[PDB]
Amino acid sequence: GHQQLYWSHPRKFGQGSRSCRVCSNRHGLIRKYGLNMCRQCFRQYAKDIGFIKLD
Amino acid sequence: MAVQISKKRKFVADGIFKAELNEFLTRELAEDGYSGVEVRVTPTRTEIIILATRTQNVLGEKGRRIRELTAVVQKRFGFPEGSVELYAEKVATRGLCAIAQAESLRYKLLGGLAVRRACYGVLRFIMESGAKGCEVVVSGKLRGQRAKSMKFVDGLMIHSGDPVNYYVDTA
Amino acid sequence: HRIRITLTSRNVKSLEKVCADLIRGAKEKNLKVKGPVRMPTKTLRITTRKTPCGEGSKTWDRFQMRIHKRLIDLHSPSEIVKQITSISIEPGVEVEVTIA
Amino acid sequence: KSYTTPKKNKHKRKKVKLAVLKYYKVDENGKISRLRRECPSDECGAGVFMASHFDRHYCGKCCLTYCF
Amino acid sequence: MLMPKKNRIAIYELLFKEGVMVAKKDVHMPKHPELADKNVPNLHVMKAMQSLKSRGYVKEQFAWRHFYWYLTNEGIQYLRDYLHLPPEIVPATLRR
RNA sequence: CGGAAGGGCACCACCAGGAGUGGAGCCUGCGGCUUAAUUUGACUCAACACGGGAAACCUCACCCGGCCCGGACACGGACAGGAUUGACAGAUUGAUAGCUCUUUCUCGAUUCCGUGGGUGGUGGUGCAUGGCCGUUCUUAGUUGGUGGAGCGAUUUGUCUGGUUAAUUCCGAUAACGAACGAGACUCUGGCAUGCUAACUAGUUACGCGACCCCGGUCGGCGUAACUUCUUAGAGGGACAAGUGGCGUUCAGCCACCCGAGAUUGAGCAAUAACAGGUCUGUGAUGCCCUUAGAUGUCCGGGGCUGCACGCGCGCUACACUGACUGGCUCAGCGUGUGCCUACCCUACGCCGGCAGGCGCGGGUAACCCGUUGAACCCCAUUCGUGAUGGGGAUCGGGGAUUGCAAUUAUUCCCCAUGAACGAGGAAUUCCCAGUAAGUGCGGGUCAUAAGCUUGCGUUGAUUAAGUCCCUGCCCUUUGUACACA
């Protein structure tokens, strides 16, 4: 069936199951500390998150 | 907490909370003069001051949009009933706020005011409000297809060092 | 009766003001209080690319988030601890109160 | 662009004029005759008839098969 | 979008009991995370609110993963005429 | 701009050296070739282990076939005598896709057929852009206001000389008052036997217990003080401060006593410009194209790995300053149970040589891994100049882990086969103090995973304190028939 084959893919792993939480793309994901977002949006919103370039 | 999250993930999740909340209120209160938020967490309650310019325009019809924003936070962030409270407050000396003058300038250019006259009006308004200096850089396509970038700088303006982190404001 | 306060904060002098205010409150309420114990700080390090694409010289950022943690023990009942911790709170410092 | 293999057409829905008229058999007295077998499932007690094919009987939405 | 009538009445009843409603940008969701009692799939929620949006009955906003809808007074009147409810009871966003 | 002159600066330049590349093997990227596809951007510094790009699925944008509309909304028809979904059997198909073909059951106004129109697009356009990054440009340069010179573009200030890493200052001066950059600033690192503190860290004394002949050891237990070792806060400390020389005796330079430093490193980093890269980061976006037999989306498989060739970054070696086997002995950056999320770090006991498997524990983290028992190095046998016990390319048989799926060996382990390589040509890369280099450990990529990158630790030097010779940069003058210079 269409309902039986529209979601027949196991998404329990891999870099396509997870994505960014801003862009929802599958490249350059910062999965560290539960950020789960791409590095460009991390550079954009690091001041709003709290990461600052000290050294 | 029953799931017992870590503090390393907790401060990062609070930073993502502040970033997503700032972006949501920036996209939603753009036409009303948004300038910032400040959040306070207590036991069983979470207070937050929205800091904006036009308080009547951010409240609407007797706090209707404020109640809508409380319901937004309650539905999206999983907060209990009455566990979060929002309060709108007027920006004192709003001419020094960089993002408020930026949103004023982009709404002037969206209404259809010319670029030179709009930059002159913004610079005259902030020098009447009283500031140390300014830097109005409007980049884009002007009078044709070639990208032409303008720059209107007068007064004291610092660029380098640690004082550029918290002595100026960039929008 | 041995009630534990954990102070976690991102900023330094605000956390110092909060723990000094807790010390002054415990000294004015005259209970057996231990010294504020400093847990070692944690520098969350993120190293990403400055460039959105990968075209140019290989530059790297060092995003540093310095978090700090202190602990204060109190020999007092729960009402005294709630009365102290319900006064003069600020968003920079998160307070965790453990009864046991 | 132009193609060589012809496309597969959509299944044309065979409409049935008065499908309830092919279910019961009417008598001049006050009684009815039920041709097709009812489905004994729990989700469909008595109001749902089954398909009367040439070799075996079948109910669709609960997927219940009775062969001979 | 062929939708179940029970799920359509449930989503419109949620939209009437609170005018502002959220949804998650994910077509592949079995159940809606707010109303976990019924089925109410997120694709049905998004397409029903998009059908309400396209004829100008609701206001749209987006924050990085989530579509937000602010229900206007014309949408209040449309949901009242659809649900055949008396105009005395009001949604909770106008409560004071 | 000058293969014109006068100064200064730079190990992305040299001298003196150190380690290398180019020589052999392997890994990764690019060009080329073949292919249904070997998706594509980038071609000097400023493209080529770069797009965080270590791709079986996804990513995937390419190809081969098949579903679905997720074509909103408006207009015109159809319709309750029913607008339209779903459906196991048999043929088809790849699948237990009603995707289709013959037979019919079911959904209930949500829907269908055409016209406008919108949405979606890792489609094209970075020569439309915004933003970000890189470069000009790690050097010290740049600009108003007034006054002055010139009709004017322009010039002075913005410099003859000295000095400095610096347009940094001294001092003359048609200049004066100034502004950005540099400097200044923040963080990192040793100096504190002084303060604040410590049962999420230890020290000293004891109460014991164990062992050896009063004494020694015990991370084996508990406690009367304390922070010296541990950690983080206020601080303080170094400023050319003092002496002796050089120098307008000003700006400054060298050596030295006292002293932990008498030049640690990173971030930010001015005006103006690049027809640099990114539309393949965005529901940032303009224009063009497609839009139902889709360039939307999903499923199944392949490919991104293909191999006569060349180039670039790296890893392993060419050995006796070494290989193998036992004994001993030393860290810190760090990380650790996830919204969806289905996936954490592991102590200990058994099964097995091994990868691993099974049980109870600890840990949301100075509590548990962990006193983080890491390598080179230290000691004692085997080797004997042989492509040999160096080296481990290639290849066969087998056993487990992760995953729905390993075939093009995902990775790990055992045995066996045992190639080139004898210090590498023109040419070329990086560097001068805890530095290069050897060496190992953490994070990202991660379900399985580091031949990459970013941090950290151990051992730890040779040679130099200069120069424009080569390559470039910055001031002054000169010449120009250049100004996409």
Nucleotides of F under 7 A from a protein CB: 41-42, 46-48, 50-53, 57-60, 65-70, 72-74, 81-89, 96-101, 103-112, 118, 122, 128-135, 179-188, 196-198, 200, 230-234, 265-273, 275-278, 281-284, 293, 298-300, 333-343, 364-366, 403-404, 443-447, 453-455
Tokens 């939480």 belong to residue: A21
Closest alpha carbon to E25 in E54, E50, E8: E50
Residues 6+ apart with CB under 8 A from C11: C92
Task: Say how many C-beta atoms besides its own lie within 10 A of residue E49's C-beta.
Answer: 22
Nearest nucleotide (C1') to alpha carbon of A43: F132
Superfamily of domain A1-55: Ribosomal Protein S14/S29 (4.10.830.10)
Sheet strands (E) in C13-81: 32-33, 37-46, 63-75
Quick check: E63 and B68 CB within 8 A? no
Size of interface A-E (CB pairs under 8 A): 7
Q: How far is Cα E46 from Cα E58, in angstroms, rounded to an integer?
A: 13
Query: Running DSSP on this structure, what letter comes out for residue D35?
Result: -
Closest CA–CA distance from residue A1 to any residue of chain C (Å): 42
Phi-psi region of B111 (alpha: psi -120 to 50; beta: other; left: phi over 0): alpha
User: C64 to chain B: which residues are within 8 Å by CB?
Assistant: none
Dihedrals phi, psi of A52, to nearest 5 degrees: -135, 145
Residue numbers in B near C46 (CB within 8 A): none
Q: Which of D 20-59 have CB under 7 A of nucleic chain F?
A: 22-23, 36, 48-54, 56, 58-59
Measured in angstroms, what separates residue C32's CA from nucleotide F193's C1'?
29
Sheet with E58-62, edge to edge strand ranges: E21-24, E66-71, E58-62
- Domains of chain A by residue range: 1-55
Distance of CA E70 to the CA centre of its chain: 10
Measured CA to C1', the nucleotide nearest E24 is F340
Query: With a 7 Å cutoff on the CB, does C62 touch strand F?
Result: yes
CA B94 to CA B171: how far, in whole Å?
A: 14
Query: Which residues, 6 or more positions from B124, have their beta carbon under 8 angstroms from its beta carbon?
Result: none
Cβ(D59)–Cβ(D53) below 8 Å: no
Determine the residue of chain E that is closest to A6 in CA distance. Answer: E28
Handedness of CA E90, E91, E93, E96 (dihedral sign): positive
Residue of B nearest to C82 (CA): B43
Structure tokens at B66: 């404020």
Method: cryo-EM
DSSP summary character for residue C36: P
The closest alpha carbon to B10, from A25, A24, B18, belongs to: B18
Is the CB of residue E93 less than 8 Å from the CB of residue E19? Answer: yes
Whether A51 contacts chain C with CB within 8 A: yes
Q: Which long-range contacts (CB under 8 A, 24 or more apart) does A25-33 make?
A: A30/C46, A30/C48, A32/C46, A33/B8, A33/B9, A33/B12, A33/C44
Q: What part of E 7-36 touches B (C-beta under 8 Å)? A: 18-22, 34
